C-alpha cells in the first residue's frame, strides 16, 4: 500500500484510498435509492467527488477480506 | 387586529427577504440552471436533469419532495 | 487638574460646548450634584454604563470627559436638578476613589491645531445641507429644528456640530466614540457619513413598505 | 458602510423574525454556525459542514430528514 | 545656534549660491576644495518657460489631493 501513493505521486495524478477490509454491505459499493431517508451514493461516486477529476488513482485496499453471506 | 398584525409582519419579513434574493441571477434555482449547462455533461443526463429542475420549480419550497429533488 | 466632584448621567449623555438644560434626576449622585453646584460653578461629567447602578460605582465612568463650568444657578428641589453645560475643551481623570464623591485629578488634555478653513467650509455647507435632509426623515424619528436654524452660522463650526450632535439621536456608542477625539475635519466628515447612511436606510425602509403594499 | 447598511437590514429581520411567532432562542442554528467556526477544524470538513448546515437551514423542521442532519 | 541637553545642538544659516567639491581628502575628518559659485540661468527662456507654465498649471492639479495636511 505504499506503492499506491508513490505511483500516484510519480505520475502527477490525484489519489484516494478505499479500505475494503471487513466490508460486508452491498450498499457500500452502490447506494440506496433516493426514496429512503438518509440515502446517498456509494463509495465510488463519493471518491470521484472528492477527487474532482475524471482520471484518478484509486487504491482498493485488501480486496480479499470482503466478507460475504450476511446481507449479501 | 392581532391576527392582522401577525399577517402584516409575516409579509414585512418576506418583503425584506425578496429584497435579499431578488437579483436577476440570485434565484439559486437560476444559479443551479446555469451550473447544469456549465459543467460536463452527456446529453441524456442533461435532459433528465432539466426535467427534474422543471419539476422542482413548481413545488412549494421546504416540502420533503423538494428536499429530495434538490439534493439529487 | 483640579479635583472636583463629577456629575454622572444615566444614558442621555450631555456634551461639551453645548447649551443644554439637563434634568439630572438621579438617586445617589445628588451629593456630588449639590456640592458641585455649590462649589464655585464647576462640574465634571460622564454618563455610566448599562444595567446601571443608582449608587455610582468606579465601574461607571468613561474615558474622555468635559470641564463643564456651570452657566446657571438653578436647583429645582424635587430630586430632578437642572443645569447648563457649556465648555471650552474636554477632560479626563488622573486620580480617583470609589465615589460619590467622584474625584478627578486632571492633566494636559492635548488639543489639535485647526488650520484648514476651505475644505472645512465646503464641509460646513455639505454638513448643513446634510443635516437639513437628515432632520426631515428624523422629524418622524422625533426632532425639532428652530433651536438650530437660528444658529446656522455659529462662529465655531464645532459648536454648531455639537448642537447638531446632541440632536442626532444615534447610539451611546457613536456619541462616545466621536465624543472621544481631537479633530473636526475627519471626525465630522465621518459624522456626515453617519447622516447619509441613516437617510439611506430610511429610504430603504420606504422601498420595503412599497413591497408589502403591492404584494398584499 | 455598505455592510453596515446590510447588517441594519437584517437587524430588522432579527426584530420581526423574533416577534413573528415568539423566540425559541438565539436561533440554535446560529449557535451551530458560531460553533462550526470555533472548533478546529480542517478546511475540507469545514466546507462539508457548512454545506450540510445550509441544506438543513432551508428545509422544514420536524422532518425526518432534518432530525438526521441535525444529529450529524 | 541653540544648544539643548536632549541630544540636539543645532545651527542656523542662510544660502546664496551652491558649489561643488573639487577633490577630497577622505575622512573622518575632511578638508575639501570647491570650484566656483553657480546660480546658472536658463538661456533661451522658452523651453524652461513652457516647463514653468505646465508646472504651475499642474501645481494647481497637484495641491488639490495634497490638502491632506489641512492647509488653506
Which is nearest to C133 in space by CA: C92, C170, C103, C168? C168
Dihedral, C36, C41, C44, C47 alpha carbons, nearest 10: 70
| Domain span holding position C28 | 4-104
CA distance C116 to E52: 28
* 3-state DSSP assignment of residue B49: helix
Q: Could you tell me if C92 and C107 are in contact, meaning their C-beta atoms sit under 8 angstroms apart? A: yes
At B45, is the secondary structure helix, strand, or coil?
helix
Question: C101: which 3 cell numbers?
Answer: 464623591
Closest CA to A17 of A6, A7, A30, A4: A4
Helix runs in C70-184, H state only: 118-140, 157-166, 172-179
Count Cβ–Cβ pairs < 8 Å, chain B vs chain C: 16
- Give the chains touching E; criterion: ≥3 Cβ pairs < 8 Å: C
Comparing CA positions, the residue from C200, C188, C53, C46 lying closest to residue C124 is C188
E strand or H helix at B41: none
Counting Cα atoms < 13 Å in the Cβ hemisphere of D14 gives 10
Distance CA A16, CA A4 (A): 9
Q: Give the residues across from A58 on adjacent strands.
A: A16
Chain B CB contacts of C211 under 8 Å are 15, 18-19
Q: Return d(Cα C46, Cα D19) in angstroms, integer.
A: 35
Q: Report the alpha-carbon distance of residue C46 to residue C67 in Å, rounded.
A: 10
- Tally Cβ neighbours within 10 Å of residue C94: 11
Chains E and A touch (3+ CB pairs under 8 A): no
Which of D58, D61, D62 is the best mutation test for B, with the most CBs of B within 10 A? Answer: D58
Query: For chain A, give me the number of helices (H) and strands (E)?
Result: 2, 2
Cβ contacts of A34 on chain B, cutoff 8 Å: 68, 71-72
* Gap between the Cα atoms of A18 and A1, Å rounded: 11
CA-derived radius of gyration, chain D = 14
Q: For chain D, which chains pass the contact test of at least 3 CB pairs under 8 Å?
A: A, B, C
> Scanning every residue of chain A, which has its alpha carbon at the shortest distance from the alpha carbon of D71?
A38
Q: Which residues of A are annotated as a binding site for ADP?
A: 1-2, 5, 17
Helices (H) and strands (E) in chain B, counts: 4, 0
Which candidate, C171, C89, C161, places its Cα nearest to that of C130? Answer: C161
Is the CB of E67 less than 8 angstroms away from the CB of C185?
A: no
Nearest chain A alpha carbon to D69: A38
Query: What's the longest Cα–Cα distance across chain B?
Result: 57
List Cα–Cα distances, D59 to C201, D20, D55, in angstroms: 31, 19, 7
Dist. CA A27–CA A14, nearest whole Å: 25
Q: Report the distance separating Cα C189 and Cα E65, nearest Å.
A: 16
Task: Tell me which residue of C66, C2, C59, C54 sits closest to C30, measured CA to CA.
Answer: C54
What are φ and ψ of residue C177, in 5° steps?
A: -65, -30
Q: Which residues on B lie below 8 Å from C200 (Cβ)? A: none
**Experimental method used, please?**
cryo-EM
- Kindly report the CATH number assigned to the domain that includes residue C54: 2.30.130.40
Binding residue positions of A for ATP: 1
State whether the Cα torsion E33-E35-E40-E44 is positive or negative: negative
Give the length of chain A.
72
Q: How far is C205 from chain D (nearest CA, A)?
A: 9
What does the alpha-carbon distance between residue C18 and residue C148 come to, in Å, rounded to a whole number? Answer: 12
Grid cell listed for D64: 425526518
Nearest CB to B9 within list D9, D16, D58: D16
Chains that touch B (3 or more CB pairs under 8 A): A, C, D
Count of CB atoms within 10 A of residue B60's CB? 7
The beta-strand segments (E) located in C10-63 are 20-21, 42-45
Q: Is the dihedral of CA C47, C53, C56, C60 positive or negative?
A: negative
Cα Rg of chain B, angstroms: 17
Residue C168 Cα, gap to closest chain E Cα (Å): 26
Q: Taking phi first (over 0 means left), then psi (-120 to 50 degrees means alpha), and beta for anything else, what does residue C13 get?
A: beta
User: Do chain D and C touch: 3 or more Cβ pairs under 8 angstroms?
Assistant: yes
| Distance, first Cα to last Cα, chain E | 32
How many whole angstroms separate alpha carbon D27 and alpha carbon D33? 10
Q: What angle do CA C153, C154, C157 make, to 5 degrees?
A: 95
- Sign of the Cα torsion B28, B29, B32, B34 reads negative
Instruction: Please enumerate residues of D whose Cβ is less than 8 A from a Cβ of B.
Output: 9-10, 12-13, 16-17, 19-20, 55, 58-60, 63, 65
Write out the three cell numbers for C52.
446601571
Interface B-D: count of C-beta contacts within 8 A: 31
Q: How many Cβ atoms from other residues are within 10 Å of residue B53's Cβ?
A: 15
Tell me the residues of chain A between 2 and 61 that have a Cβ less than 8 Å away from chain B: 34
- Residue pair C61/C6 in contact by the 8 Å Cβ criterion: yes
Distance CA C115, CA E70 (A): 6
Amino acid at each position: 500500500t505504499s506503492l499506491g501513493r508513490s505511483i500516484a505521486r510519480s505520475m502527477n495524478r490525484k489519489f484516494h484510498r478505499i479500505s475494503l477490509g471487513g466490508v460486508r454491505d452491498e450498499a457500500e459499493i452502490r447506494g440506496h435509492r433516493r426514496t429512503y431517508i438518509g440515502a446517498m451514493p456509494g463509495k465510488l461516486i463519493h471518491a470521484m467527488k472528492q477527487v474532482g477529476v475524471i482520471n484518478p488513482v484509486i487504491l482498493l485496499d485488501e480486496i480479499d477480506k470482503m466478507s460475504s453471506d450476511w446481507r449479501g | 387586529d392581532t391576527n392582522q398584525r401577525e399577517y402584516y409582519l409575516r409579509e414585512q419579513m418576506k418583503a425584506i427577504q425578496k429584497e435579499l434574493g431578488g437579483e436577476d441571477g440570485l434565484s439559486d434555482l437560476e444559479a443551479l440552471r446555469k451550473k447544469i449547462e456549465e459543467v460536463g455533461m452527456p446529453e441524456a443526463v442533461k435532459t433528465k436533469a432539466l426535467k427534474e429542475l422543471d419539476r422542482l420549480e413548481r413545488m412549494q419550497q421546504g416540502s420533503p419532495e423538494a428536499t429530495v429533488a434538490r439534493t439529487y | 487638574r483640579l479635583e472636583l466632584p463629577v456629575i454622572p448621567l444615566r444614558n442621555t449623555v450631555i456634551l461639551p460646548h453645548t447649551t443644554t438644560p439637563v434634568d439630572v434626576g438621579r438617586a445617589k449622585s445628588k451629593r456630588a450634584v449639590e456640592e458641585a453646584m455649590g462649589a464655585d460653578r464647576l462640574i465634571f461629567l460622564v454618563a455610566q454604563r448599562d444595567p446601571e447602578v443608582d449608587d455610582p460605582a468606579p465601574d461607571d465612568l468613561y474615558t474622555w470627559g468635559v470641564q463643564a463650568v456651570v452657566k446657571q444657578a438653578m436647583r429645582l428641589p424635587d430630586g430632578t436638578l437642572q443645569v447648563m453645560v457649556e465648555a471650552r475643551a474636554r477632560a479626563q481623570v488622573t486620580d480617583y476613589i470609589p465615589g460619590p464623591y467622584l474625584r478627578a485629578r486632571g492633566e494636559v488634555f492635548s488639543e489639535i491645531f485647526p488650520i484648514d478653513e476651505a475644505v472645512v467650509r465646503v464641509l460646513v455647507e455639505e454638513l448643513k445641507e446634510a443635516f437639513e435632509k437628515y432632520v426631515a426623515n428624523h422629524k418622524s424619528l422625533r426632532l425639532d429644528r428652530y433651536q438650530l436654524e437660528a444658529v446656522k452660522g455659529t462662529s465655531d463650526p464645532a459648536m454648531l456640530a455639537d448642537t447638531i450632535a446632541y440632536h442626532a439621536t444615534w447610539t451611546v456608542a457613536e456619541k462616545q466614540e466621536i465624543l472621544e477625539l481631537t479633530d473636526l475635519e475627519a471626525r465630522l466628515k465621518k459624522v456626515l457619513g453617519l447622516l447619509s447612511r441613516d437617510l439611506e436606510r430610511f429610504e430603504l425602509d420606504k422601498r420595503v413598505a412599497q413591497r408589502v403594499k403591492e404584494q398584499m
